[PDB]
Every structure is written in structure tokens, then in C-alpha cells.
Design a protein around this ligand. Structure first.
Ligand SMILES: Cc1cc2nc3c(=O)[nH]c(=O)nc-3n(C[C@H](O)[C@H](O)[C@H](O)COP(=O)(O)O)c2cc1C
Ligand SMILES: Cc1cc2nc3c(=O)[nH]c(=O)nc-3n(C[C@H](O)[C@H](O)[C@H](O)COP(=O)(O)O)c2cc1C
Ligand SMILES: Nc1ncnc2c1ncn2[C@@H]1O[C@H](COP(=O)(O)OP(=O)(O)O)[C@@H](O)[C@H]1O
Lengths: 366, 378
């Protein structure tokens, strides 16, 4: 019968996850007379702390008072109104409330039904999309320059190959020479050939690093990728009189990772450390790996550079945060997302020399 | 008898209407009836699926399933219901018009008195899944582009790295030639000739490496600048070698179409890049002539032209049919031109490329004039 039918739909209402309230405007200050379990879960308030209150109790410091005015106006004219608004859970947490209110007429009596949607997650995701799109535009000039470097490097292969052929041909001809100086010319040529090979390796590394590529997680040696990242990222270090120390542990060497991504994380720490040590009297860079909890391996990169002022540390990883006049402030933000996608954490601290120490973790392999 | 809210039928109507304002899909089924038919459905479900209430009531909800519905996740539901268990699946369903949508389905048993009902909550999350896929594409794109930009930040250090083995090679072969001097072996001149060709290739290599520093910065700020001064300074850097290459320089600069709003350093970089490209383009060429002019243009701009008689830009640039735009190819020079164009556009101007009668290249760009009227002055 009609009761029983009522009981069925009320229980169904408590299973919808959106918040549902009904207010009775014939009662002083338009109080909530019905609330479903969805609104309870959403707001953190118990039913007894909701029923009999006007809905404005969800409002707080950063609630837009003009969108509040939009609500009040719509209700005075018994008009429907949709609004996205700042509300507050019982524990004080802000949520974004997408509010939909409609007048209802039952037996010639007006009620208002409110449907509330917590869209905080939705707004976070949208903000993240906008932010990613913005970071891409932010680094586009530098990325073009990286493309130009890769392309010029590739073009460099051609005269190098020609130099090799000329030296190879020359060695052929010198084979028939009995001149006393002929061994010395051959030595010079071999040494030149070594240099051609080393120039070739620099090009190879640059080009492998910028390639779009496969993106698989695989068993990788930390020793190997630290040296690979160092070859790229630590250029100029010897000339800057920076003392490099890689203190590695062979028992903690294999991780599960996309090696180029871990390389780019290390390249960024290295370039940042060299920049931070530019005006430093002592210049020492230490890289260390150790076993860590939950079958992880922790990598530490420490420098003796200008380090971190007291207010700085909790901003380091924030997108666009930089202390440099020409900074982008994306490097650390991108690195942390790579590390978290590999299942680890990345963090920073001041060290005892007044410089900076960065740590990250990756899962150990077998 | 009871007034309005105080009464049962009034209450039923109020809650019925409330449920119809819930935009989520809500269905109630009755498992005591054959094949567990739907006995209640809200307007939310009507809106979501495209079916009217009359086309829903009395059916088993599997009627939304179709071609690419996962039988695994269907079986998961079937099992869970037989054991009166809550269940959530994300499943593929189809609207009345055949459109596929992603249905996040929450199903719970309800007891009203001693009777079991099932309540199903449906959410179309198709757009949510798309936003997630897009987010992952952008993240992945950023991670890649980020490696490129790390290398871009290191452009100058990369040049320094590459310069060392090249300089060593040149010295080894200069030293070798001295050692060969006065050898009486008849193959010696063939060796010397090869060493010299190799010395030339080493220099070519150095020219290529030097281009890495074309756009290396410093913070940029625009000021009133003299085009003629900019052109002169860029000439001294980029055209040193024109005499030895026997390139004729013909500069028709207009005093009084001279002042622009510009970043001195960036604009010099654009000019030096054009000047170097023009020299390279005119090596192995017949007529060797470089023309630079500046001229008032529309919308308060000044237009600069750099024309050569070289072999053309077809390896580095693809101009559109109207020669109002160009697409850069994946070469050192092509990417350099795209950086130059980006610098000009950040100055408010345009850069473009035309063929000329020599079969060479003409590049043109605009910068805002520091004075609001020329060109209506002739
Ligand atoms: C059915 C209904 C639901 C409402 N839900 C909310 C809500 O979830 N959050 C909120 O801040 N205000 C909500 N309001 C609005 C407040 O109750 C009040 O109308 C608003 O603050 C404007 O009135 P005022 O200027 O007197 O505060 C709701 C109003 C109605 C009628
Ligand atoms: C309350 C309720 C709501 C349901 N909603 C859907 C739905 O929206 N889409 C769907 O494909 N199946 C839905 N189902 C599941 C189907 O009715 C059916 O249980 C499923 O196909 C498994 O049973 P079967 O293998 O006999 O077809 C729902 C089931 C219940 C009890
Ligand atoms: N090794 C380091 N020593 C001191 N400060 C650092 C170091 N690495 C990063 N930082 C600080 O973190 C900020 C953000 O760095 P990052 O995200 O790589 O972007 P950017 O280098 O463009 O600023 C830097 O501007 C600097 O303030």
C-alpha cells in the first residue's frame, strides 16, 4: 500500500550518494525537514545536527557572498537555481558544492528540494589539466632548443664520418711508408680516432635521452643509470672543480624502472646542484644508494651549494615555484610525479654543510 | 485525515518528486517476481538512457547491455545478487539511440520489513574516463618534452662538450702534417691531401656546433632600439666571413624607419641566425649577394628583409601556397627558424618566407615601431 511504498523510496534515497535536502519555507527561516544519508556522508554532520537548520550553516569564510545572493533571490521568486559554491564539512574541510535547487508544488504547498554534489575532485582534475597544458606552453622555447640541439648533433655525424674515412684511408697509405716519422703519424691518427669515437658517444647519449621511445618499466642497474645521467648532466663539473663521489652499494643496485625517466630525474638534480654551487667555496656532490623499507631502494643526492632558506622547503616541488630569475620551476614537480608513478617518494632536506639533499625511492627488483 | 506534510500520501508525493530531481540513475527491482524486473525508475535514469519510463518498468536491467559489454563483469553482478551482496562494476551499456556510455553501477539489497528489494544507482562516467585518458596523455607528453627542455637549458655546455674532441682532432691532424713534411715516400701527398680534407671537415663540424649557442640567454625586456645599430652588431658577429666567401653585402637601411620596440639581445639573435643561414646557403653557389632592407609596414610595424642568392630553403622550410606562413622541418636550421619566429611573435610581429628570382631565400619579419605613423608618410 501507499505506506510501504513510502518506505521503499526513502530507503532508496539513502543509497543515492548525492546529498538531498528538502526545506519547508512555511516554517521560520526555511529549515531542512528531510535529509538523506548522502548529505550526511558528504558533510560529516549527523542527521540531528542538520534537521531543523537552514542550509546556510554549511557556509564559511571563502563562500562567495554574491552567489549566496543569487540563491536568496531565486528562492524569493520561487525560481530554480544552480550554483557552484564553497561549503565546509563538520571537520572544517572545504568542499566545492554544486548546488541545484528547485521549487516543488505538492497539494498547493511549496517546498524546495536541494541536490548537492561534492565536485572538489572534479575541480582538482580540471585544474590539473589546465596546469599540464600550461607547463607544456611554459617549456616550449627550451624544448625547441633541445630539439635543435638534437638535430644539430645528428648533423654532426656526417663530417665525423668523413673524418673517419679520411683517417682510415690515410692509415691504409701509411702502411706502405717506411719513413721514420710514420709510427708517430699513426699514433696521432689513432688518438684522433679515439676523439671521434668519444664525440660520437656524446651525440648518441643526447639523442637516446630525447627520443620519445618505449616507456616500459624494467630491471635496471642504478650504477649504470647514475653514470648515464652523469655523462649528460655533470658536464662542466670537473672544470668547475666539483668533487664527484658515487658511493654505491652493489647489493642494492637493481630497481624496477623506466631508465630514461630515472635518468631525467637525476639529470635535473645534477644541473640544479651545479647551479647551486656556482658561488660556493667547497663544491662536493655525493650520490648514494641504500636499502629502504618495503623492498625499496633509496637514492640520495647531496651538494654543498647555497641550499634552502627556511621558508623554501615546503614549496620546492610546487609547479612553477622557482627562486631563479630565469627559472621555470617545473623540474622538481615533474621529477616527483615520475617517482610517484614508479611507486616511490621524493623529498628534500637541508644538510649539515648548508647545502641541499634530495632523496627518492624506487622498488627493488631481483 | 492529515494536512500536507503531516500525511502519508503528501509525504510519498514529496519524496517521489525529490527522487525525480536526483540526476543520477535510480532503479528498484523486485526479485520475488520472475527475472527480477524493474518496478521503479527515476527521471535521472530516463535522461541518462534515452528510454521513457514505460520502456523501462517491467524489464530486467540487462536490456542496457549489448555488443562490448564485458561478460566477466556481468557474471560478477549475477553472482553478487544470488548471494544478496552489494556490488560495484564499471560496465558498458547502450542508450536508446545506440550510443555507448560507461555506467558505474552501485547495487545494494534493501530490506523493507521482510521483503528483499534491490536498489541500483547508475552514473554515466564516460566523460570522466575521457578526462582521465587526456590527463595521462598530457602527463606523458610533459615527461618527454621535459627531457628536450633539460637539453635546451644545457645548449651551451653541450657545445663546450662537443668542441673539445673536435679541437683535439684538428690539432692531431695539424701535428701529423708537420710530421709528414719532407717525407720522400710517394704516398705522402695523398696522405697530406686526405689530412687536409679531414681538417676542413673538422672546421665544418665546429661551425655546426657553434649553432647550439644561437639562442642562449638573461631576462628579456623590450626597449626602444635602433634597427640599424642592431643590424650592424649582428653583422659583425654573423657576417664575419662574408669577405672570405666573396659574398657581396648590400644594405639599404632606412633612417627614419629605424626605431623599434625590441629586446636587443633576442633581435640580434634572430638576425645573426638569418645571416649565418644565408652564408651556409650560398656556399657552393654562383651569384653571392645578401640584401638587407627595413621598411615601414601596416599596423604601426617595421618590416625587415633578409634575402640571399643561395640554393633555397626547401630542406628546412615548407612555405604555404600564399607564402604567408612556413612550416619548419626537423633540421638544425628548421628548428632554429621556428625559435626565431617564436621570438618575433613574442614581440608582436610575424615572420615569413618567400622564394626569390635567384632561386634563393627571402626572410621577412616585423617589429612594432616606436613611432605610430610611417607608411602613411611614404
Ligand atoms: C533546498 C535548499 C538547499 C540548499 N542547500 C544549500 C547548500 O547545500 N549549501 C549552501 O551554502 N546553501 C544552501 N542553501 C541556501 C541557504 O539555505 C540560503 O538560502 C542561502 O544562504 C541564501 O539565503 P541567506 O542570504 O539568508 O543566507 C539551500 C537552500 C535551499 C532552499
Ligand atoms: C537494481 C539493479 C540495477 C541494475 N542495473 C544495471 C544496469 O544499469 N546495467 C546493466 O548492464 N545491468 C544492470 N543490472 C544487472 C542486470 O539486471 C543483470 O543482473 C546482469 O546482467 C546479470 O544477470 P544475467 O547474467 O542473468 O544477465 C542491474 C541489476 C539490479 C538488481
Ligand atoms: N640543489 C639545490 N640546491 C638549492 N636549491 C635548489 C636545488 N634544487 C632545486 N632548488 C630550489 O628549488 C627550486 C625549484 O627547482 P626546479 O623545480 O628544478 O625548477 P627551477 O630550477 O627552474 O627553479 C629552485 O628554483 C631552487 O630554489
Amino acid at each position: 500500500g501507499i505506506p510501504g511504498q513510502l518506505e521503499v523510496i526513502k530507503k532508496a534515497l539513502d543509497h543515492v550518494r548525492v546529498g538531498v535536502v528538502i526545506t519547508d519555507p512555511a516554517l521560520e527561516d526555511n529549515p531542512i525537514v528531510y535529509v538523506n544519508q548522502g548529505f550526511v556522508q558528504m558533510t560529516g554532520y549527523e542527521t540531528e545536527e542538520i534537521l531543523g537548520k537552514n542550509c546556510r550553516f554549511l557556509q564559511g569564510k571563502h563562500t562567495d557572498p554574491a552567489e549566496v545572493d543569487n540563491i536568496r533571490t531565486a528562492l524569493q521568486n520561487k525560481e530554480p537555481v544552480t550554483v557552484q559554491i564553497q561549503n565546509y564539512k563538520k571537520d572544517g574541510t572545504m568542499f566545492w558544492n554544486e548546488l541545484n535547487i528547485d521549487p516543488m508544488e505538492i497539494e498547493d504547498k511549496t517546498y524546495f528540494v536541494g541536490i548537492q554534489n561534492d565536485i572538489t575532485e572534479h575541480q582538482q582534475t580540471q585544474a590539473r589539466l589546465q596546469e599540464l597544458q600550461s607547463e607544456l606552453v611554459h617549456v616550449s622555447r627550451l624544448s625547441a632548443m633541445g630539439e635543435m640541439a638534437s638535430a644539430l648533433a645528428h648533423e654532426l655525424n656526417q663530417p665525423l664520418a668523413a673524418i673517419s674515412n679520411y683517417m682510415k684511408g690515410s692509415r691504409r697509405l701509411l702502411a706502405g711508408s717506411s719513413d721514420p716519422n710514420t709510427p708517430k703519424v699513426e699514433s696521432a691518427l689513432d688518438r684522433a680516432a679515439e676523439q671521434a669515437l668519444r664525440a660520437g658517444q656524446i651525440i648518441r647519449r643526447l639523442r637516446d635521452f630525447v627520443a620519445r621511445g618505449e616507456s616500459e618499466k624494467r630491471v635496471e642497474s642504478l650504477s649504470k643509470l647514475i653514470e648515464e645521467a652523469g655523462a649528460l648532466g655533470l658536464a662542466g663539473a670537473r672544470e668547475q672543480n666539483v668533487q664527484l663521489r658515487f658511493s654505491l652499494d652493489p647489493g642494492a643496485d637493481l630497481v624496477l624502472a623506466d631508465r630514461v625517466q630515472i635518468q631525467q630525474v637525476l639529470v635535473n638534480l645534477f644541473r640544479n646542484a651545479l647551479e647551486a654551487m656556482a658561488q660556493s667555496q667547497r663544491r662536493e656532490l655525493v650520490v648514494t644508494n641504500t636499502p629502504a623499507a618495503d623492498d625499496m631502494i633509496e637514492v640520495e643526492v647531496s651538494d654543498t651549494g647555497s641550499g634552502f632558506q627556511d621558508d623554501v622547503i615546503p614549496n620546492l616541488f610546487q609547479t612553477f615555484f622557482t627562486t631563479k630569475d630565469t627559472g621555470m620551476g617545473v623540474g622538481l614537480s615533474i621529477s616527483r610525479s615520475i617517482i610517484e608513478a614508479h611507486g616511490g617518494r621524493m623529498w628534500a632536506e637541508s644538510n649539515a654543510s648548508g647545502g641541499a639533499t634530495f632523496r627518492f625511492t624506487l622498488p627493488a627488483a631481483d
